[PDB]
Amino acid sequence: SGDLIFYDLDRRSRIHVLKNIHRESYGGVTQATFLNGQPIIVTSGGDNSLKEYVFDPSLSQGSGDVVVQPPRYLRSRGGHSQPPSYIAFADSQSHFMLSASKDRSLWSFSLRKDAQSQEMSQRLHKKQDGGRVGGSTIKSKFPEIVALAIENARIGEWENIITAHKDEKFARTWDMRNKRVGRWTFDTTDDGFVKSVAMSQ
Amino acid sequence: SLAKSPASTIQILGAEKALFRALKTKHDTPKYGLLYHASLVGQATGKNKGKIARVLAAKAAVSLRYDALAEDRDDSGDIGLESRAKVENRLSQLEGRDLRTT
Amino acid sequence: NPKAFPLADAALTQQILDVVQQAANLRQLKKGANEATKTLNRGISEFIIMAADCEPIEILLHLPLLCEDKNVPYVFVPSRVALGRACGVSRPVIAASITTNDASAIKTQIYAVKDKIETLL
Amino acid sequence: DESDINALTKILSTTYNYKDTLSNSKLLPPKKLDIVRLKDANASHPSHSAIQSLSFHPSKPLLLTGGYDKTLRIYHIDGKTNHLVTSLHLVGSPIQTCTFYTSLSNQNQQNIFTAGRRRYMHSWDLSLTAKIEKFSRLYGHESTQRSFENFKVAHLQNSQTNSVHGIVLLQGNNGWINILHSTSGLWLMGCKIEGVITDFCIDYQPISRGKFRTILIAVNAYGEVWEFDLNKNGHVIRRWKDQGGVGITKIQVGGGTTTTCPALQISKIKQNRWLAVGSESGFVNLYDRNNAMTSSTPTPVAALDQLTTTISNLQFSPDGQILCMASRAVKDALRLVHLPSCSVFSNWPTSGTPLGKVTSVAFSPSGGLLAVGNEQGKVRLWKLNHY
Amino acid sequence: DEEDIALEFINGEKKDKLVNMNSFTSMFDNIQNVQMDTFFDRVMKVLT
Amino acid sequence: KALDLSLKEFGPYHIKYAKNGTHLLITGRKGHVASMDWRKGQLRAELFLNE
Amino acid sequence: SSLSDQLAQVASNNATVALDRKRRQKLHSASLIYNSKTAATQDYDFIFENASKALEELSQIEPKFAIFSRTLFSESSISLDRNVQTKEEIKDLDNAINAYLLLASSKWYLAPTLHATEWLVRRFQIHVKNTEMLLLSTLNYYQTPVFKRILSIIKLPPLFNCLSNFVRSEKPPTALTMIKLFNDMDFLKLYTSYLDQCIKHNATYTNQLLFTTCCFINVVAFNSNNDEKLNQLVPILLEISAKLLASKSKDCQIAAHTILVVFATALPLKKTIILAAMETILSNLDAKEAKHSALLTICKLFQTLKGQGNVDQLPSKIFKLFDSKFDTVSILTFLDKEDKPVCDKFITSYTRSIARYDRSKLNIILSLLKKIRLERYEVRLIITDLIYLSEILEDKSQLVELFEYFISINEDLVLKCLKSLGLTGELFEIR
Amino acid sequence: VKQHLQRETQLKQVQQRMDAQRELLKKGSKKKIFKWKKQRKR
RNA sequence: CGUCGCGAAGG
Fold this sequence. Notes:
The structure is cut from a larger assembly and holds 8 protein chains of 8 kinds.
Chain D: H1 7-14, E1 35-37, E2 51-56, E3 62-67, E4 71-77, E5 82-89, E6 97-101, E7 111-115, E8 121-125, E9 132-135, E10 151-156, E11 165-171, E12 176-180, E13 187-192, E14 200-208, E15 211-218, E16 224-229, E17 235-241, E18 248-254, E19 274-279, E20 284-287, E21 302-304, E22 311-316, E23 322-327, E24 334-338, E25 343-344, E26 358-363, E27 369-374, E28 379-384
Antiparallel strand pairs in D: 1-28, 2-3, 3-4, 4-5, 6-7, 7-8, 8-9, 10-11, 11-12, 12-13, 14-15, 15-16, 16-17, 18-19, 19-20, 20-21, 22-23, 23-24, 24-25, 26-27, 27-28
Chain E: H1 2-11, H2 36-47
Chain F: E1 15-17, E2 23-27, E3 33-37, E4 43-47
Antiparallel strand pairs in F: 1-2, 2-3, 3-4
The structure holds one RNA strand.
């Protein structure tokens, strides 16, 4: 169902549960092992996640093995559970690529060694007028991402990449450096769906 | 002619000379006066005795003008010890805060 | 409530609570019993309204004595929660004095209310 | 260790969810609402003034919208989209309040009653150009209707024969409230209280099988209200004072059936439990009506003060579980209170919700849709997940 | 009739009295040297 | 007292206890020099270098 | 990793040893009675002999201390050192100190107990290394100069780290910071392991039960509007409500009753755990106050059920147990008390189960239904089960008595129930 | 006595303007027309 | 029937 429970057999008890590591729809937690002698578990489902979870040493010095901390998060690797819709190469170095997925998510993947495969977070920056943000307050993900555009000319100084979503009346940018959404979406000002974005080099 | 007086002057009824010299120069007027030797502002600690001096002056005004102006009371002290209970749990719930960030 | 001397009727209660609403709009009143006695001693109060709904009535009827000494008009109203909701405070007040400002915008209704209060002694 | 009063320990070790989370509740979970947005109800066709009144058809999926831009539209509404069906436009006359009406007996009338700040109200008939009538004739009492600015619509069984017909009810000018006839337009009676009529609401109560007496409850501007039945001639059967409250501005009864949710069968009528009188100091007193029956000076079951400024619209849920307070003064000025425990819903009306200057609010009869119309000229549509 | 049965079920539901943040901070004054039954019906007084 | 001050980011270490058995002085071949009590946890002179 | 960390490890591992005179006076001036300038000149025999007098006074007011006067307060114990022996002996002396502290946790209003335990604070260094048993064995006296002295002497273990702004400060810590200490669940597990060790040693007393109950109800009150924290916090408070109910004293019994009723009103629990908690609080009812308190918690805990099954049949294995531990008589008197706590859903399920499982005492259901007020769907449901009962067995006179009561009140409801099932003419032909 | 009375009037108007200037900085959804938005101080 | 700025169960 997606859940992962730790039983304790010297007390027949439940140390800690862990809810929704891997999503239930792709199978939930498929294989979740300890390591021989080590207090870290490695979990992988079918939704292209692979996490490891460390147990802390006990917090009470005298009693010890009856107050066990919940397992902390640690190093993880991850795809995005559905085939990607668009592919871009960020830098001229051929080091980082951008994958626009089909589960409505944008990721930055590495090519050298896979330590830095990370999702660009969809926390919208505040609109610059002094008032509150646009869009959904609840973190539901964006629409399906059709066509994007990418260059490295003035990276970091302002918004770098832009993209165009499925049947969305505007096309919104991101930032390659901060790895999140930029401020200004551009409407198409004609009441039409956006299909083809590009950027000056 | 004590019941015909507000809670603020029942608070500062004692130390009026420090009050008036603090008013006619530029200082800050006192807060306990004659109620400082009561049994509850000594129970409080810090500036909690200042806050308790104000709330106990207000309840002293309530109780005082009740049993000075009523003409049918049984002299049992009912709203007296009721106001004592209210001042006491007010004192407890204001000393129970801890302004040191834990 | 036998010691509650003059308490208003329905229509007079309604018109004085609308004028105390306009007083709280224009910020021309001081609310609360001890504040009422403060402004009565320093002699600014046009009139006093007081609520005959508190469990002692002697918490307020000490200000009638100096109010009679200073000849100010004073009148009771049967609901302290009405006093609170009409004075603009989320707590049930007891007494309210209306301070004196001849350059107001509600001077004539304040004075008509003042005559309707001082007529019933 | 092994080779195999302990009851709840064994079942704590068995299960690891600890609420009856499912549909096996039938009640609103208190202090935590479950509510989603939907598409904007005024998206397929833009409006132009403040949406002064919203309503629903009591059986059909039609959301009726009317404002100060002297038009009235009727949308067909659902989740992903919503479209316009018709949009009548009355030149010359705005509409301060406009509402559906279905007759109780035949269920095939479908009138629209639309009234503005002028002296006339307009009656539209719906059976699918289209005709309307101009109710403009008070018969005997023309010096008691400065305007038709506020009205209601309510059923009446005539108590010597079961000729159930509708009635519109108008706000007077001195202390009057006239009733009329919905179809014909005769005067029937005019009741009157003192002070100023500020608002009023319609209770129903059944008497036997297929027979019911209605009750008009009307407030003063001071707080003593009159409740008089009008299935006989309108004379007062009870008069009682609000415990507190001075400048009161709206009253709404319900929980059973009322204007926002009438019935279609006559025997599906129901005595309304909750009553809610709301002031201009933000305060809302709400009573039950199983202990305020003959008390003549009852106690408020709750005295909410959660929203600050002068409240205008307070509605109920169609089954009587969620009250909605809405003050038309400041921005983002709507709240929902869980009515049986009289708690206030914490999670939904937060600052990340675009309520705007709320000036109308209306519940759906059965879908749990919640329409909020603001001043900028749109109406947003939330859906409550529980219903 | 079934809708009337369910609506009667949700009408017949009395006013509960919830718990909140400082619902029991008053117990820490009379915590000391009180019999357990007196503490229990004091808690039931605060609840009901 | 049977300690193990295991350090890995500087090189193959080296010991010198003091003349009396109180203080300890350890030295990595990369840059690390630490003079410290060892029966008490009182690190009183740590210094990295780059030689 | 960090050499500073690997040295602070051995610092906290060898804090209980003196390697120069300054560390000896810093580790010796920590005393429970005297201040620094007098406790820094106390030889061990002095505090030992006044503590032996203290233990003798404590023994002649409490008969479970002659074993300690034999073993741990012996004459050779002034020369027994702490950290010169082997780890098996240090573990044995460790749980010896634990046994002493949770034996003498209930005596801290006495100068003999203070001067007695000062000796093993001074000698066996329990102000440093056996720290947490001392803290959460004397935690309940938190408004006391003995607790302020304990907290100034001791260093804080990392669980109690929100007390650290009350060392060297003459105000005792507050109830709100005690609740902020009880809030985080990784202290709460440790405190519950202490509590059930105290239960199984049977030293539970009416001060620390009161303190534990008030802390648990305020923790539940702090998480009143935190659904995730309450869902995580149920199997701690409930599990030791269970192994507190498995004890025998009426104090700990109705303390578990109190945490049970406040948790049930805090969130709507599931029907099966409400039934099992009712079976648990009912299978071990002994004393007199336990009866009244268990009845009130059964009534309120069963009332907080908003969802179907909320008025269903309570099953047989707990219903006959309820009939055993509570008579049908004095349920009448609890109903006949004046203030009438809200018990409608439990009274309804009681009526449905006495109708469906006993079917031989119906004067009782007539009497209690006559003397309680009842809600309309409940009375519709009990007359529906009563019609099922009347058509499964023969119509006796008490059955037609309470049926004509249900005719004399709410004619429309019984006629609507019979319109759902048949016809009143056939019903009157049956009766 | 007349000089006392003009001192009374002058101190009255000084306390008037100074108390208004102190009262203008408390709170309130204010606007210079000096009136307040009618919402009760919670 | 002449009558009268932004904001999908927080920032």
